[PDB]
Every structure is written in C-alpha cells, then in structure tokens.
Design a protein around this ligand. Structure first.
Ligand SMILES: [Cl-]
Ligand SMILES: [Cl-]
Ligand SMILES: [Cl-]
Ligand SMILES: [Cl-]
Ligand SMILES: [Cl-]
Ligand SMILES: [Cl-]
Ligand SMILES: [Cl-]
Ligand SMILES: [Cl-]
Ligand SMILES: [Cl-]
Ligand SMILES: [Cl-]
Ligand SMILES: [Cl-]
Ligand SMILES: [Cl-]
Lengths: 216, 216, 216, 216, 216, 216
C-alpha cells in the first residue's frame, strides 16, 4: 500500500488476516468492510494479491473477475485512450485493465496515485471489487427479508437480529430498506408483540420497540 | 488513524482485537473503554470500519445507527450549513453525515482534523458512538442495582463485585450513583455483615467496609 | 503514551497484555511491576484506559477509585488553584482530577508533560494508582508472614519460596521486612534445619542458609 | 527486501508465513500469489532464503533449480558478458547466476536494483521462480479440466468451484482457458441444469448461469 | 531500553517473552543468554522491571537481591561519592543503589548512559544480575560433572549431551572446564567406547570422538 | 543487528523463532538457511546470542565451538596482530576471538562493520558458524545417498523426495553431487521405472523423468 505518500509492501499479517477472514466467514456481509479495512491505501497489485491468495470459492472469484471486466469495459467506453507519444513531464491514460492491475506495472500504479492531480486507480478498482463482492454476498445469502418472521416464543431481540442480518445482505437501496424497516419488522412480529408495537404508533425507535417487547 | 499529525491506516491487529472483543464479551461495560482505546485518533472512516466489521448483534448495531442519526440531526440543527462557494484557502462546514463519515471523504476528514483551528470530527463522532454504546450496554444489562442483595453465606467481597458490576451498567449520573453507594450497599448486605457496617458509621471507606466484613 | 517526546496511542497488544495479566493472575504482587512496565510514559488517559478495560474485580477497582480520590484531594490541599486568566504563553495549574485524567483533555495532559519545566501528571497519577494497587494486593493476600512455617519434610527451598512470596505481599517498610528476614525465617524453620542455621551465626547469606539446609 | 529504496532484512514472520504456507497447502495454486506477496521488493538473497527454508518437497525444489538454471542459461545467451575493467562510476553486467543470487553478493544485488537505470535482478529472478512454481503446480495437479463433470445431485455452485479450481491449475493460455469456459462448463453440466443453461444462449454471465441452476 | 541513542519503553512481547522463559525453563543455563538478549540496551529501570515481573522463585530472587547488594557495596567501596554541589554542566556520581536503579530516576539513568564519556549503568548492573543468576543456576543444578557416566547401552551422542549440559552449569573457570573435558569425558565413557577413544590418542576432536563411537 | 547502517538489538520474535526452529527440527538441512535468514546483518554478539540460547544439543554446540576455534586459529595464522599504539583515527586489528565475539565489545564490532573500508566480522563469523553447522547436519544425517533405493510399489515422486533430501545432507561438492544425480538416481530406481528412464537417454530433465514414471 501507500501510507500518507510513501510506498510499502503488503504485510504478512494483513495477508494472513484476509485469508483467515474468507476461510472462517466465507462471504458473510462483514467480510466486505474487513476487506476494505485491510486494503486501505492499497494499489491494484495489493488488491489482486488479496484476491488471488484465496483458495476455494472459485465460482465467486470467477464471478468477481467478470464484474471487474464489466466495470473495466465501461471505464474504457467513458475514457477512450488517445493516440500520441507520452511526453517527458506526463504519464499515460490508464485503461480498465491498468486499473485492474493486469496491464500496468507497480511503478505506473504508484505514478497515477501520487501524481498531481491524483488518479486514484487503487480506490477505483477497489470500488469495482466491492461491487462484485456485493453481488456474491447477495447471491450467497440463503434467506429473503420477506421470510423473516418472529417465532411464537422467540425473544424480540433475536428476531431483530435475524431481521437486520438478512436485511444487511439484501439487494436494496436505502429508501427500499427504509420501507422494509417501517413495513415488515412490525408486520412479521408474533401476535403478542405485534399488538404491543402497533400501540406505540408508526414513529417509535428500535430502542422503544425493543424495550416494549422486552417483557413479552 | 492519525498519530501525533500524520495519517495512518487501521492496523490488522487493532481490527482483529475489536472483532474478538465483541465476539467474546458482547456488550459488557468494559467493551466501551476497549473501543475507545482501540480508536484513539481514529477518523470517521476508521470508526465506521470498526462498527461495520461486527457480525451479529445487528439489533444493537441498528440501534447505534439511529442514535448516530439522532446526534447527527441535532448537530445540523445547531450548526446550519450556509450557501456559498468554498474559497481556496478554506474548507466546507461539516454536516452530521460528514461527521458520521457517510457523506465525507477520507481527505475531508483528514482536512477537518488537521486544519487550524482543529475540527475534531473523529472525536465528535466517537462521542456519539459511545453514547449509543451506553444505550445498548444499559439495555442489555439483565439486572437492576436494586436487586443486588448479599446471600446469607456470601463473602462480602463477592457481593461488592456484583454490586459495582451491576452499578457500572446502570443508567445514572454520578450523584445518583453516589446515592446508591451510600444507601443500597449497606442496606442490601446480609444481616450479620449489615450490623457490622452500621456500627462503623456512615463515612467509612470501602476498604474499611470490606476489611470489616472480611471475617464474617 | 509518549516516547522519548512524541505522543502515541496505546498499542493493541499492550492493552491485551494488561487485560490478560489481570485475568490470569488477579492481584498477585508481580501484576504491579507488569502494570508499571506496560504503562511506561503513559498519560492519564492511557492509565484510565488500562484501569477501565478490566472486567470483574469491581470491588477492587472501586477501592482504587477511592484511593485515587484521596490522593487527588490531598494534592488539591497542598496545591490550591489560583484565580486569574491563563496567559497566552502559559498553561493552567492541574487539579487532582486533572491528574487523574477525569477533568483534563489529552492535549492538556500532553501540554503538562512536555512543557518546560515538566509537570509529570502521568507519573504522579501512576504513583497514586500503584498506591491503590498495593492496598488491594495486601488486602487480597490470604496469609500472614507470621504463619509461614516449614513442614517437617519440606525442602528448605520451598519454605523460602513461600516465605518471600508472602513477604512480598506484606504491609511493611524495608526496615520491618529486614527484621522479618533476620528474625522469622530462621525462627519458623523445621527443627532439623533450624539447628543447622543457628550454627552458622546471625550474619550468613541466604545462599549460605539454602546450601546449608540443602541436604536436610 | 528494499522498501520504497532502503535495504531491509527479511522479517521473522514473513519467513515463518512462507514456511507454513508450504507445510499446510503444499503447491496449491494460491501458494504462488502468496509467495509473490511475501517476496515484494525481495533481493535474490531473500528469494533464495525463502526457497532454501523449505523442508521436504525436494523433488519439486530440484525441478525449480533446473528451471532457474534453464532461465539463467537463456539470459546468458541473450546477454553476453564483455571483457574489460569495470570503471569506478559503473557496475558489472549480471550473469544468470548473479540474478539467481548464487554468484553475486548482497551489495551487488542492492547495487543493480537501486542504480539508475534500474536493473531489477530481484524481479527477474522472481519471474523465473514463479515460472518454475507453475511447472510444479501444474504437474502436481491430479485432475484434468476435461474430467470435471457435474454430479446428478450436485449443486451447480459446487461444480463451478471444482471447474475453476481445476482450471486454475491447467497449462493453458487465456485464449485456451476462454475456450474451456465457453465450451466445457456447459457441456459437462448434469442433464437437468445443462438444458437450463443451453436455453439462456451462449452469451450469459456466470452470475446468470449460477442463478439459473440455483433452484435445480 | 535505548536503541543506537534514543530512549524507548520496554515492549509488551519482550516483557512477555522474559516471563514465559522463567515459567517454562526455570533457571536452566540457556535462560541467562535469553535474559541478556532480551535486555540489550536496557536501563536499570528496564532490568528491575524484568526481575520484578517474575512470580514465584522468590528464594532465588531474594538471593539475587543480596548478590546485587554485595556488588553495590563493593562499587561504593571502590567509588566513594564526594561532597560538593553538582555543577550545571555536569552530573552526579552514581552509587551502587543508583546503578541498581533503586535510588536513581529514569532521566538520571538516561543521563549517565548517553553523556560523554559514557557511564554504562545499564551494562554494569546487568553484569551484577548475570553474576547472581549464575549463582542460582549453579546452585539449582542437581547433578555434578563427576557423576556423568556413560551407560553400557547408551549412545555416546546422548552421553556427550548430558556431559556438556551438566558442564554448562558447573562452577568452574575455562581452564578447569578444559581439564574436565580432556580428563573426565573419556574417563567416564563405557568400557567399549572408552577403549576406542583411548586408541585415538589425547588430541582428537569431539567430532572425531563422536564419529569413532558412532557405531558402538 | 545493523539495518542498511544503524545498530539495533535482536528482536524477541527473531530470538524465539530461532529457538523454536532448533526445538522442532533439530539439525535438519533447512535449519541452516533459517539461521542465516534470522541472522541477516547480525553482529558476533547477536550470533553468540542465537547459539547460546539453545538448550540441549550440547554435543553439537560443543562441536560448533571447536570448529569456530579452528577457524579462529586459522584467521590468526593468516592475519598476525602487530605491536603498536592504535592511533586516534584508526581501530585495532581483530583476532579470531574478536571475530567470534568472545574478546571484543559491541562497540568494537560495530566499529569494524561500519568503518570504511568495511571489516565484516559479522559475516566472517557467520561463515565459520555455518561451516560448523554443516559438520553437524552431515554427521547427524542417518542415511547415505547410496542407500536410497526406490521401492517396488513406491511412487517415483516419493523416491525423488527421499533422494534429494538425503543428497542435501551429503558431504559433497557440486561436481560430486552432479555425478550422484546423473548416476545414482536412475541406477537405484525400481525395475519398471528404471527401464522407462533409461529409454529417455542420459540428458532428460527431472520434470521429464518424473512425468515419465508418473503412471508407473
Ligand atoms: Cl493467481
Ligand atoms: Cl481519475
Ligand atoms: Cl458495511
Ligand atoms: Cl468544531
Ligand atoms: Cl469506563
Ligand atoms: Cl509538578
Ligand atoms: Cl540451502
Ligand atoms: Cl535489465
Ligand atoms: Cl516489585
Ligand atoms: Cl564508569
Ligand atoms: Cl552462555
Ligand atoms: Cl576484512
């Protein structure tokens, strides 16, 4: 990576941490923030390193490649490379494959990221990767948010855990996710607690809803 | 984070330490000082990282979001953003969402924190988070301080452990907590030790109270 | 902490090390040097961090608070704060609560410690804490030094281990501890070895005493 | 290694990490990116270190030596060393054995890598090593891509895992690997899912293919 | 410690390493080089830290105190402190107790070690400690070198291991240890191997002696 | 050690790593590259540290001492120390014992290594140590290369592992080791595979030989 801006190689325990995360948790939603955390300031070389060191899950890793290729193709459409000799004081325009690290050197990647103005190929490629990770996470989620219903003897707290866990893996914008909160959470509660929450009105906090069905 | 003031990415073992803390201890009172300890000099990006890497406990994490949103809304009320072009020498006013890291870049967060005078968005957001963590801890505490009573054969030392453990998780200011100490501790002791402590008078130290009921 | 004088946040494994020490060894005498070791150059913020991250032992932690408050009250008595506007070139007088970190900022704590002449609030508060730790250790020691007596078939070496272990936790100055060595050690040995040591005279080293009762 | 350009010795946990990788995973495809990751900025001395610290697998390590010798011999053919005294301001031409580290000193290796223009002996030798590692991985793969066929009750997702796992270890260029994807994957699926995928047409993504055979 | 010359606090894992060494290996000869290794550049404060963090073994730790006090008393005899006001440009003469760290501050210890000419109180105290450690190791060794005799079916290699292990813990100068090698090793071998070694003559290497009795 | 050229103490986990290597793997060939790896830039003090921290194996450690003494005696023969006062601008000539670290200070060792021209006592002593380590490894190898013969049902790959493992521990130059490869490997294969390899001719690679006897 590059620390704020001097270049550094990816650390053994960063590498190891990422490997263990995928081994232990597969593609559970929290893996993605972990990935981003472990890739702060990462060059495409470091990002590819993290991806390539994953054994197994090669259907997902292939899916991720395609997503990255789609995003790369789109970048090329919007940003066409122009014919001409790259002047002494300047550096060339990056393609999608240069951003994905496959067709660019470490020094070129360092060049784009540090040069003024900054061309953050690390952070661009990272967004493409996270995009592909979301597609995987969402596909690899077994349950739908519509199916999360509170059991008759289930403590509300456990139902809310399942609800927002499943919600975290849903393919939905924030406005849609807002609708799911205000509609489904109360709708799919068990009869006893459902009554209790309906009596609070449709503008009570989760704290208030959780403390309300705490006894029941 | 930023070390005293050069920017740095959050370390693998900081990340891992925070993850294990929540796994092992859930939301026991000591988790909060640990959080603060592990987030010293943290930017909103680093703070969000720590929060987002938590798997499970999504009812609490959602509660935390709402608290953060409430604190954000309050910040906006007190600090209204003004219309105008941000001059070359200056930086824009942060909103609550910029402080919560959701609508601000890493560079902007670095900008506010390092610029003179300092606009410590890291430390502001951290207070909001700790506020929300307290709401969770206090809600997730099973016992009330009123219910902590010494068993007939219970060593005083173990009763005082339970008392100040439960006290640590109570929703109460210091003055109220002072009242609980001077009132309940002696009140809820077992008959034999209760007599002993009453004889010391109402201005004896815990050391004196503990050593007094040490034999009994 | 501050490394010799640039400020730094407390490390994950410092934090973790302190936590494990208390978990594994409770308040055994060696915990205190460990605490001091792990808190070298620590600010009050770092010291409070270490204390607050302890789960359980809240009777002791409360005792420690009172001791710290007593030492704070005493500091205020000897050092009264004066009325007046703090000039541009100067910094305010610290109270006991500023030294205990509860009423002072990190920057103020950094200010006092680095400014010339040095006002070492870190090292002052640390002494108060160690004072309170001793009160706990000594109270939480089950045995008295008077009760350490050598068994009839006990190897002297094991008796000396028990003696100086129990001695380490005693409430006694060095002169009193010197008296205990020269009086009790030989006095409370078993008959066979007691005779042997009496024959050496009252000015023989522990090495000489241990090697003398090595065969017996 | 050399960090961007100051020289450094290879770290204990880099060393250990590489050792454990080979112990745990033998020569599974992901070992190679790990090797490269752990050898970022490595000198030939550091590269030889990593190779020599491997116990066992000495048939492979010998194979690797031969590959390295072949690449070394080829370098010498293309780059013949010229007779003459190396001037004060200059440094000598590296042979293949100098690149492989066997006939060059650490200082010479540092010299070539840092001097302008750069003579990256570290990165050249690394390519030769990775070349030899591929020969081993590919030879040590038990299965052929032609033999990966979906079981009648096998979830497609598991079949795609096996397919792209085995594909990763194949001796094939990208164009050949593209042909294998578009030809064999669908061809060797089980009857029920095979029909489903044929109906999508020959330009559907893996995401679309995987989600299509998700129910079946 | 002080790294070559900037001051630093003792690291968590240095501390922990020393603690585990004593727990696992007690006072086996190799502990002493480990101690010295872990205390490279250590101030008396750091040295006392390492010693004080040892739980158990308090007979030995007390023995060590006495040795340190003896060495301190001897230093004072040879180096008497003179009466007079310490000038602005100078620093005071250290006593034995200042060297042992008990009566000197960290800054004074830093002062003596860094000032020109150097007054290495760290390295002086370290020698006293190692002196006391040897007394302990040698006392705590169960066996004498005279008692190491080769069993009739014992492989010579195992006998030489026992011999030089026991030799390492002996109270003897190098000349005496040389005599033990050339005299006892061959003398105390078993009849079959004893004959073999006598035939080599009295100037053969251990390699030659070990390879000679390898078959037998 | 000294990092490229500022002095540093040997790290806890370097120390620990070396200790574990000897505990786990004794004197298996790969230990030697590990030693060298862990001793990059090491002073004689650091080298002695690593050697002295080994518990057990004292027959080997004694053998190593003798080898070091032999190499030291040889250095003294070739490099005789001259009589005269060492001038202010210069430093003294090192003896073998100064190189082995026994009769030289840390500062002298730093002096020789950093001064121009460089007198690399660290790297000289290291060669002597590795020389002595080879003598041990080779002596402690149970099997001869002549005795490695392929079993009738043994996969060739396992036979080649045993061959080059045993070869690695042999006392032989590269030319002799080349002869062993081209002569014995094929000679000592089992009848079925022996025939197969003879048919390839006497200039086929190990890759070709291994892939040839892969089916058989
Ligand atoms: Cl790869
Ligand atoms: Cl851009
Ligand atoms: Cl997230
Ligand atoms: Cl502000
Ligand atoms: Cl707290
Ligand atoms: Cl003061
Ligand atoms: Cl080797
Ligand atoms: Cl080149
Ligand atoms: Cl102590
Ligand atoms: Cl001196
Ligand atoms: Cl030693
Ligand atoms: Cl030389």
């Amino acid at each position: 990576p590059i620390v704020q801006m001097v270049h550094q190689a990816i650390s053994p325990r960063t590498l190891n941490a990422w490997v263990k995360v995928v081994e232990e948790k597969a593609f559970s939603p929290e893996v993605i923030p972990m990935f981003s955390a472990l890739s702060e300031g990462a060059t495409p070389q470091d990002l590819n390193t993290m991806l390539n060191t994953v054994g197994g899950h090669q259907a997902a890793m292939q899916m991720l490649k395609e997503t990255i290729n789609e995003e790369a193709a789109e970048w090329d459409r919007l940003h066409p490379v122009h014919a001409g000799p790259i002047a002494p004081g300047q550096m060339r325009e990056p393609r999608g494959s240069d951003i994905a690290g496959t067709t660019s050197t470490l020094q070129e990647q360092i060049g784009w990221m540090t040069h003024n103005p900054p061309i953050p190929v690390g952070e661009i490629y990272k967004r493409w990767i996270i995009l592909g990770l979301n597609k995987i996470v969402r596909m690899y989620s077994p349950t739908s948010i519509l199916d999360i219903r509170q059991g008759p003897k289930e403590p509300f707290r456990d139902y809310v855990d399942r609800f927002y866990k499943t919600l975290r893996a849903e393919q939905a914008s924030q406005e849609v996710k807002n609708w799911m909160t205000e509609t489904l959470l109360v709708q799919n509660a068990n009869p006893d607690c459902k009554t209790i929450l309906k009596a609070l009105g449709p503008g009570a906090t989760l704290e208030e809803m959780m403390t309300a069905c705490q006894g029941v």
